[PDB]
Design a protein around this nucleic acid. Structure first.
Ligand SMILES: O=c1[nH]cnc2c1ncn2[C@@H]1O[C@H](COP(=O)(O)OP(=O)(O)OP(=O)(O)O)[C@@H](O)[C@H]1O
Ligand SMILES: [Ca+2]
Length: 426
DNA sequence: ATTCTCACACT
DNA sequence: AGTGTGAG
């Protein structure tokens, strides 16, 4: 098994929220700019950064006040606020624009508001029979980089790309309709076309990775951003992984990746090949060990899920610092604010996508606790009604109130969370 | 006060 | 059901 059965792409909308604001406000185009939320504390938290601003060092999670110190001409657009919380509807709606276009070309799995995996295997097959057996021109791949090329016996970026692509296409074996390299290349032609259609029909630019699975496709996508696409072939994996830090591979950016590094005493993905599968399973469990043994040879089997819609709809807000909720009627009021936004989105979801959610999940965070959530409770969701929803949410959390007073809430709450789950066809 | 989401494994 | 990890 060489993990070359599929053609999979990962498409990533370049700094998506910024692009949405730049389409809407021409003044912001081709300028260093960022999208922020909650203007009051330190000028707002930055949640998306244009490439012009990233060259000054502006990143996500900065405060806008701090970003302006790195980039004094930074322009800002602020997220819509509804009922005291950031409202992402404009970006969600723009996402649906893009996903609907992508769905014309192949079946897609929505990964987040601005990424989608694409399964191109069948689309490639049909495009290879329509193509008689004729060469693929470099003109069909005007923004494609071939990872690892050029090599062997130019000083500008576009010169290198064309040389890499020339060497790739020159050695391509077009007469064999089953070569995985040829299948990737056709896959890349289809993604150029999909990316052309997205930009024509929305104005949005994006990057893409093309490879044989989601993990390599995702890694590839990040190699030549913005507005470019990268093909990572099976043959390119040993050189690519030989200096690729473990933490860059999807699902290894956290504790598991750190302990792969610490327990095995290695730094790069390719060093994993020297261990037997049993060795890896004993250190990291059957599932992780098998997965690691295959992944470091470029092999991964997670399917592109034919799923363009989320499985839960949730509304959370944080109350950090002295803003932690400390009274009963504070908790009730914010639960109602979250329940009302939830109600808006559930009804819109029942009209568009013909489904009703049946379970309500409530999560709270307590001041002093260490973790994302302190506590998770559920109850039935039988009516899309904000006052019943918030009333029910309070009911299943009210006994977490350590305080003996009826009107006070101790310990103060640093996070409220409502989530609709367990959908049924409607 | 990276916030705000969403998916999945484990038990 | 409830907790913990990982991601965009
Ligand atoms: O903490 C986060 N880390 C990454 N992402 C986050 C985070 N919190 C929320 N998000 C959501 O994930 C969208 C795109 O996150 P992304 O990583 O794909 O990066 P961008 O499009 O900003 O620019 P790129 O770097 O892709 O050119 C963001 O806007 C927002 O909706
Ligand atoms: Ca993106």
């Amino acid at each position: 098994a060489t993990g070359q059965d599929r053609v999979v792409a990962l498409v990533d909308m370049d700094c998506f929220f910024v692009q949405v604001e730049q389409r809407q406000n021409p003044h912001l185009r081709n300028k260093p700019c960022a999208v922020v939320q909650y203007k009051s504390w330190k000028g707002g938290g930055i949640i998306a950064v244009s490439y012009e601003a990233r060259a000054f060092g502006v990143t996500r999670s900065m405060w806008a006040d701090d970003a302006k110190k790195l980039c004094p001409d930074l322009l800002l657009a602020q997220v819509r606020e509804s009922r005291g919380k950031a409202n992402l509807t404009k970006y969600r709606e723009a996402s649906v624009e893009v996903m609907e276009i992508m769905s014309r070309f192949a079946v897609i799995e929505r990964a987040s508001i601005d990424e989608a995996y694409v399964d191109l295997t069948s689309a490639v097959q049909e495009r290879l029979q329509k193509l008689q057996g004729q060469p693929i021109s470099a003109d069909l791949l005007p923004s494609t980089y071939i990872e690892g090329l050029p090599q062997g016996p130019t000083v500008q970026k576009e010169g290198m790309r064309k040389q890499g692509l020339f060497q790739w296409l020159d050695s391509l074996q077009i007469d064999n309709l089953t070569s995985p390299d040829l299948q990737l290349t056709v896959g890349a032609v289809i993604v150029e076309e999909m990316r052309a259609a997205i930009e024509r029909e929305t104005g949005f630019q994006c990057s893409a990775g093309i490879s044989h699975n989601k993990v390599l496709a995702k890694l590839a996508c990040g190699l030549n951003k913005p507005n470019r696409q990268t093909l990572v072939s099976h043959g390119s994996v040993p050189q690519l992984f030989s200096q690729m830090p473990i933490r860059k591979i999807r699902s290894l950016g956290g504790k598991l990746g750190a302990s792969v590094i610490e327990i095995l005493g290695i730094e790069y993905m390719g060093e994993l090949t020297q261990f037997t599968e049993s060795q890896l399973q004993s250190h990291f469990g059957e599932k992780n060990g098998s997965w690691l043994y295959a992944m470091c040879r470029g092999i991964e089997h997670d399917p592109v899920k034919p799923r363009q819609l989320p499985k839960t709809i949730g509304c959370s807000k944080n109350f950090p610092g002295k803003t932690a909720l400390a009274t009963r009627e504070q908790v009730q009021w914010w639960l109602l604010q979250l329940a009302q936004e939830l109600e808006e989105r559930l009804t819109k979801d029942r009209n568009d996508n013909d489904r009703v959610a049946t379970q309500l999940v409530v999560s709270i965070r307590v001041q002093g606790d260490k973790r994302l959530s302190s506590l998770r409770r559920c109850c039935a969701l039988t009516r899309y009604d904000a006052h019943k929803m918030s009333h029910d949410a309070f009911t299943v959390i009210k006994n977490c109130n350590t305080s003996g007073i009826q009107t006070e809430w101790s310990p103060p709450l640093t996070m409220l969370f409502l989530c609709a789950t367990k959908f049924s066809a409607s």
